[model samples]
Every structure is written in structure tokens, then in C-alpha cells.
Target: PWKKIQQNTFTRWCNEHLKSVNKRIGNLQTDLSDGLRLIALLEVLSQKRMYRKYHQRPTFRQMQLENVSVALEFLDRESIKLVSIDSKAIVDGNLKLILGLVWTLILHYSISMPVWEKKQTPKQRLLGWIQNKIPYLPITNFNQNWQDGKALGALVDSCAPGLCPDWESWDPQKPVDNAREAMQQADDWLGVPQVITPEEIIHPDVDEHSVMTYLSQFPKAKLKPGAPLKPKLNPKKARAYGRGIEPTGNMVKQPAKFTVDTISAGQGDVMVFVEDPEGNKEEAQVTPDSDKNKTYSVEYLPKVTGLHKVTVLFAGQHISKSPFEVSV
Candidate 1:
């Protein structure tokens, strides 16, 4: 069922474009033997002519082999992989070999698009696309996860935003109607053709590539740009202590420490002053920590220990808890 779906889906996909050149393939094995339709298909899909002309009357085995090789070499020049397939197999009219070649063409022209991010493979890009639109689907694969049809409904609703407003209300028991309705609305509204049948999509052994072919035609979702969050200085986060929590919360003419959160305020100036009870003010050395979080450390030595006041300022503005009282 999987292979057959892939074959028909790929064939119709080709013919849809091949219609431009008035050339279409009836049989993957037999029709592509001469390489005429293959060359025509590539030229139509890429909108570029082949490098060299192929035989118009390739009846002989030798002529057919040469013609097939021309098509294969064109794909190689385009950097598309041939994998295990060779010109001889194509000239011999092998079904699986020919199907593989068509599938590769489908991937190159339709699936492996450069419009999306290039780091991910085509499959990953497609799966990530579905995940971005319908984030709650829990979808990780192209097969069984899509069998329920709700993923398709949610995907459509995401695109048009009300195409299927009650998608959540869809019954899980009737998978057939769900799949059918989703495909129908997608075709009618989104202008995306339903190349793969609903039954085939719901099949346990549905072809992953075929499902990808159907879903790839949907419109690309527009992602919103990131919002900029301004960095702010928090004064409530500021703290002043005397030499690491002194037993009496007082330092005797020793160095007192002050710390404050200056995150996103890295470029501003921070100053700390220690004023003794007798109104003698001493400036502290303020330095930002090395952790890059913008946390700054202030160090000052107290001359006296009774009811000393600490003042912290950032950009000439008093931070919260600016006049912190410390008994030093």
C-alpha cells in the first residue's frame, strides 16, 4: 500500500507540472525507458533546458542507454544524488529503480526547498513546520501521528484561523470523516490539491513521503519576529553587609561590603558611599563581577561603628533601598 501510494502520488505530482510541456508519464517503468519524458519532466520542473539534446528516436538499446545516461548526468550536474540507481537500470525499465528516480525528483523540486532554514533536512523542516503551526499535536513522525486527521484540521485552521474552529470538538472515533473533511476544506480553501487519498493517509502503513507530498503544498506560516525586552536595574535586590555578616552586624573600622543587581545596566556608573556617625563620608571602590550578570561589588572601610549610613547610586539616580543603614 505504501509503495503504491508513493508511486501514484509522485506520478500525479509529476504530471501536474509535466502538463506544462504537454508531456506526461503513464508508466514509471516503461515510459521513462527512453528518457524523453524524464528529460521533459526535469526541464519543466526546473524551467531550464538540458545541457545536450537526447535521441528523438531512441528505439535501439544502445540509444536508450545513452539517452538515460544524459538524464542521469544532468541530475548529477545539478547535485542531486543518484544513490544506487544507474543509467543501465533505468534503460532496462526497472520499476523500483524508476520510482526511486521519480521520488528523488519530487524531493529536489518540491520537498527540499530553500525557502525554509537550510540546517535541517527536508523531513525535519517539514515536521518542524507542522509542529510550529499546530504545536499541541505531539507529532514526531510523518506516519501514525497523522492518522487521526485532527492534525490536518488544526493545520488548516492555523493557516486561515477559523477554517475549522471546532477542530478540538472533532470526534476521535470517526477518523474517516475527520480525514475527509480536512482534505476537502484544504483543497477548496487553501488551493492545495489532495494528491493522497484520505484512506491512504489513515492507513497504518501509509507512506511517509506521500504524506509529505500532500502537506508540503500548504502555505508557509508567517512567524512573528522576537520582541526586545529592555534591561532594567533593580534596587530592591541591593544589599549591604559588614564583612560577611559580622557577629554583631557591626564592623570595627574594617572593610564593609555592598552588592547590588545591575543587570542590563552594565554600561551605567555605580557609586557607593559609607558615611560615619560623625558625618565623615568615604567613597567605596565599586567593580562589576566577572560573571557578566552585571552584579557589582562595593568595598569600603568604616572609620567608626555607630549607626553608619550607606548610599548606592546608579547613573546618578538612587537605587531602591539607597540609604541603607548599617551599624559598623
Candidate 2:
């Protein structure tokens, strides 16, 4: 059964939808490699399968066109089945470790999907998944950053969830919110459902750990300019600071002005690395900012800008926007 869905029909769908779904939600990267790929493949297929059980519409695995709400409902069902399968899969020695992560994400994804369903609009349904997804996948690979926030909230946007994200409008004076804060903010901004996906419906294993802790094990993928790993890292809803970050800045005093990057302060090790024109890493510091006493921030003076790459590590893992370029 799993093998059948693990084929071109299913793989193609996962290949296409997985990236878009997460990308829409502000996620930087997915763990679709090795057995993990198999995990995602199965989970995505599971959504389609579950959708088929109760729907007249074509599965997302094989699509034509219909209501966005229809697609979401099917995906929602699929996530439910995913929890069931992964719950048992986690005990299966064949691939319990990776499967555990898959189940966790399925749970998280299901938990995250309600908002898109809350409001009814073609755009909301069409792009709902994009701004609605969150960082719930367990972090099997935290070496990368996972600077996650709520969907549209984490996205490099201004004017809140409703307006266009003005990239040029981002500033550094402001701060960024952690995933938890972002989740809460998006919930408020988008009017996300107040309750969890219902304990009775979710798998038993999901409650054991918090979503962030699971994702922290494997920070999200590196941030691409067009993708996540970057946010204005907005401390609040009204401001944008994503633009103010740079490597060739100054640090006059402790928490200096030269220090530009802002991040959610973590109790564990946080790091920011800067690379020169030659791509040689010029190490920078990731410290708790006493100045604002809010999020952790980073600042560095690049020897030569050209196209410097800056990598931010949350708890030593890459935040989604690591290796971001600061062209000087």
C-alpha cells in the first residue's frame, strides 16, 4: 500500500505540493531526503487517500480543478490518516525514527490547517495553506536554522496579513518574534481557531512534546531571499526590520549599532556566521541584546562585502534565512 503511493503518482504530488505548501507558510526547507523523503511521500499520499474516502472531487495527487476549500478538506483528512499510520510506524523498526517525525508533522499540519478553513475566499483557499502552515516538523537536522513564525506573519511582509509585504519597508530597529509568538500573532491577525485540533482526533503521541521542541531538533532549511530564513523578524505587527540587517555595520558599544540582525532569544547557543567575498566564513556573534532586552541580535563588520553570506543558527541550527546575502 505504501509502496504504491510511494511511486510517480504520489512522488510527483509530494515533489510539487510539499514545497509550495511549506513555502506558502514561510517554511524554509523540508526533510524530504533519504528515508525522510519516503516519510513525506507517504504522508502526502495519505492526505490524498483520506480525501478520496469522503469526497467527489479529484485527489490533489491527481488534480483537475475545483474549490480550494475542497482541496483543504481533503488534505485535512489526509493528515488525520497520516497520524494513524505514523503512530504505528514509529514503533516499526523498519523506519520508526524518521516516521516519528513524519507523524509529528502530520499532527502539526492538521493542527495548523484550521485557519485556512475559517474564512471563505478563493484567495484564502488558494493561498491559505501558504500563509497557514507553521514549523511543526520535528527537527532531525537542527544544524540548519529554522527562524520560523506564523505563515504570513513570518513571511517578509508589512501591513499585516492583509497587505502586500513591502520588502523595502523592512527595518532593523524593530525586533522579531519567536515561532510561538508568531503563531499567536498570526492566530490573532487571521482569526485562527482558538483550540488545538482536538485531542480526541489527534494521535496519542502528539501531546508528548511541544511542536517547537520537535522542530528545534532540526532547524528549518536555509533561507533564500525569495524564501524563508528571512523575515523582517518583526518584533511587533506594525514594523519591519528585515531590511536593516547587514554585515558591514558597526558596534560602538555592547549591543552596538553595528549589530543589525535580530532574532528570538534562545536559552541555548545561537550563532551567526558571515562569509567574505571569497566565501570564507568571518565568524560573528549571536548574543542576547541588553539594549532592547528582547530578541537575540547579531552584528558584524565584513572585511569585504561583494556578496557576503550570513548564516544564523538557532540553538546551533540554521534559521531558515541563514546564508542570506548582504551585497555591498
Candidate 3:
């Protein structure tokens, strides 16, 4: 059946774009070199395959390779500078998809393996198979960094379905209630339903009500109630909190001053700089930062155009210096 499908529609499509497709496949194969690398790269590039086969999006490792490849390709093809996109979204979404594919593949292999072929159990066999496949994959190194957070989350979600507490009757809004019931349902799942903490959810600066409204998707989960009855502090009368240090000999320490290069965006230049210990520097241009910590304005400023690095002395000591670039 698979052969027939490939021979019919798949073949036809490939034949239509025969040159490009073959070239891409060949390039991918040459670059991958091993099964693990091939799978990792494919996890990012082939989103359709990941979703259709694994029912999830690509993983972080996959996304990293995808971004690197895309950036390199774009640079090779175009002479112009400046590229903009939600890099975090691209990485996260792609990683999830890839993990789904990996899980699906592991499940399929486990189910397909013979019952009495080896000494290891089905789960063990599946794990061994995955471990064996990892070395050949290109994203193995990248996977190492994110495996704990991203991979473990996906793995738990995939594997703990039958093992963990199951609240089949619980509705979405009451996650806390559902979690409580689920805990009772299965003793193996011991952790309490995590409260939506200010640190956990995005947009911490937003009002509690707004945060709760957004977190309402997990209906069974409950957020810690706000202490509305607590007394408010008067801004003008509030004393400035000092660091934990007692005055010695009535000496007042001078405030430390640090210099930060704030890059303002303009047209055509996007590259940034980094200085190495050997008094060497390199350009590392990237997509604009999306985090709330940094802000940018679109204006034509030649001063902020190229790579900018600033060094400042603070508290009678030289502090670390950072370099960044601004482009539109």
C-alpha cells in the first residue's frame, strides 16, 4: 500500500518538481550522514510529515537546524541584509512538532517489534532503539541542551497517559478539581496541580485578572487567589529599600555606573559584533529580540547602524561588555 501510494501520487509530485526535489533530498542526505541526523533535520524541514505521522510539531533541535539552514541559505542567495521573524515561536513550535514525530516513531517501532526477539521489554527496546538512532542525528548536540525541559515535557505527555492520574470526567475550566480527582484516581501521579504562578506564565506585568482570564483554558486548574484585603503602600511615603548592609564609619558608597549600548534600528544593516579574549571581534547578526526586556525604535540613525560594543567601569571594577546590532 505504501509503495503504491509512493508510486502513484507521491511519484507524480516528485516527478513534477523532479530536479528540485531530488537536489533537496540529495543535499539533505549528504548533510545528514546518519540516521539520527537525518531524522533531526527532517523533523524541522518536513512539518507535514511530522504532523501527519506523529500528530505533533517539530522539536527544539529540529527548529535549530531549520533556522540555521534557512539563515545560511538566505545569506547565500541574497546580498541584502536584514531578516525579521518570531524566532522563538519558530523554534518552540518546530520543536514540539518534532518531538511528536519522535514519539510516534518510537510507538510504532515498539508495537511492530516481535514479542520474544530480545531480552529487553518492549519499552526498553523502544528506548534502546531511540538511543541507537540519536548518534546519527545532526541535532544530538542541540538536543542535549533542551532535552530536560522540552524533551522531558513531551515524553511525559506521551508516555504518562495510562500511568498518570486520569480525570476523564473533569472539565477544562476546573483543572485544580480535575487534578485533585486525577491524583485520587492514580497514586503514581503525586504532584499537585501547579498553580499558575507569576513566574510560570508569560506577561507577568499584566493584571492578575487578565492573567487568570488567559489561564482559564486549564479550567480544572486553580490559581492562587489575590489578597485584595491587603493594605496598600503609599508611593510618596514609601521608604526606599536598601541592600542588606549596615552603615560603617558613616561612609556612603558611590553608586556604580555601567554603560549599555542601545541600538536603534534603521534600513539595510543588521549585523552585530562580539569581541573575543584575544582582542578579536566577529559579526553575529540575528533576528530582533522579542523579549519584553529589550525595546527598539524604527528610525534612521547612522550612529546605531553597524555593530556596537560599549565597555564601562563600575564600582572600581571593569564589568562585562556586550555587543549588539540594530537593523530594519
Candidate 4:
């Protein structure tokens, strides 16, 4: 009773509340827009990190999560306000898009065991994405980046169940099944995503002439099918750390013989040259099997632990997937 408002004051309060609501709604729209932008940026970084394409700064990783926290703060609050609004305002403004975005965050990647057992989940390692994503806004001190090693280390104990303190280290580690695929769930509004191609992502960091010199190493594939055939190493897949591909049995123990299969390789092609991490080059024994359509096997053992680039020339051009990065 003591706080009863005058008629004019009560009306003023009603006007003020409606105005505040508009501000929050406006704020929500911008935040949602930012949310999408962050998604695209993080996607590229996450893909590279998940694939272990290169060494990335831990600090950058932490900042990305920090950004997610900011957006979530705005989203989680305005979403709560919806419960108190009239059904018409709630449904008419298409407010559910906020909740829609929330669900996207919750189930973005693959979390099933079957996807793991076959061991070919494309988005497996990126599972770190959801772990880094927060459903609601976080406080100022909530997240940490590489810049704060000690703070980042502190997250180990409270991280999601089954997630590791160093999971990020392991995740940006694989080319397959990154956890963030879970984010695909929210893509309801994001539209269709695009696939990253091998040619688009991997280009030589070296100079044009160096690439030519490197190309010169492969002679020419005389029995060319118009274009050089795609040759491959016995170890079809590679890991960034450890020996990604098993030199497959005793082909090499310490510096074991690494071999390539030219499915459409000609009998006449000879010479296999390997370039090491330090740019030192060596010639391996190239043998043409005494069989019909004899394919050449250029044998090399990984003496060093980086890209062991092997080049074989066919018809004066490097075979497809040549100068292959065979990790040691």
C-alpha cells in the first residue's frame, strides 16, 4: 500500500517496460547475428585445428570460446523473458528462432558410439566444439586462452564429464569425427554448409620456381591417360603426430621401406626421390615388377618425422597426389 503509484506514474511505468522490451529484442537480434559470424570463423579454425593441419596458438582457441560465452549470455536471458510474454507476441515475432539457435548449440555434433566404432566419423575430433560452447552467458572470468596457461589448466577438473582437460590438444589432432559436428544440429537456420576441398586447402607455401623445381623431379608418365594417374602410399592415411600411417608391417622398423602403388602406373617410369623435413633429398630404389602393366614401387623409410615428399614422374609430369606428404 505504501508503494501504491499515482495513475500517471503507473502509466509511465507501463510505457517504460514496453520500451525496455524493445531494447532487449533489438539487442537479441544483433547478438544472434554475431553468433552466426562467430560460427563461421570458429568453423575454419576448428577444422584446421581438428585436422591438426598446423600448429595454432592456444590463446586463439581460448578467445573463441570466450566469444561464445558472450553471445550465450544475451540469448539465454531474452529466451527466459519469452515465457512471460503474450502468446501472440511470442509466436508472431518469430521468437522461436532464439530457441532454435539454442538447440543448434546443444546438439551440434555426433555423440553416438556407432559413429566412433567404425572409426570413420568425419567430424569426430572436433567434439571439442560443444565442450567449448556454453548454453548461457558466462561471467567475465569464465574462460581462458593460451595466454593464461594457469587459468586454462584450472578448467581440467570442472570440464564436462568424459571430456579431458587436454581434449582440445587431442581433438585439433585428427582429420576425422571432430566433436563440433554436433553443431550441425542447430544449422536449421544456417542454411547448407560447404565442403572444403583438398586442392583449396593445401597449396605449396614455397615459391613458384621451387614448385617447378619440385615438379621437375618427376620425369613424365609415358603411358599417360591424358592426365597422370593418382598414385598412393601403402599407408593410405596419415597422422600429424606419431606415425599416422603404419609403414604397414616390417616395410620399415627404423627408417623402413615406404612403398607407393601406381594403379595405372606404366612399366617404363623409373626414379623415386624423397625430400625430407629439412629439405635434404635422397633417391630410393625404384623397381618395375616383371608382370603385365608393371607398376613402379619407390621404397623409402622415414628417416625424419615430417613430410617425406616422394615424387615420381610420368610423361614429364608428377603423378596425381605426388610429392605426397608421407609422415615419418
The lDDT of each candidate is 0.75, 0.36, 0.28, 0.33
Judged by lDDT, which candidate is best?
A: 1
Candidate ordering by lDDT (highest first): 1, 2, 4, 3
Q: Score candidate 2 by TM-score against the native.
A: 0.24
Cα RMSDs, all models: 14.6, 19.1, 25.4, 24.3
Best TM-score among the predictions, by candidate number: 1
**Model 2 weakest 10-residue run by lDDT:** 194-203
Estimate candidate 2's alpha-carbon lDDT, on a 0 to 1 scale: 0.36
Q: Write candidate 1's Cα lDDT for 9-120 as tens digits.
A: 8877877778888888787768888888888888886778988978999989899889888888888888988768888888887778778887787777777854753587
Report how far off residue 291 is in candidate 2 (Å).
9.4
| Candidate 4 local lDDT, 78-104, one digit each (tens) | 342223322222123333453334223
TM-score of 4: 0.23
lDDT of 2 by residue, 61-171 (tens): 222223223433444555443333322232222343434444444344433333322555322332333333323333232112232222223331332422223322333
TM-score-sorted candidate list, best first: 1, 2, 4, 3
Could you tell which candidate, 2 or 3, scores higher by TM-score?
2
lDDT of 2 at 237: 19
Q: What is the lDDT of candidate 3?
A: 0.28
lDDT at 253, model 1:
67
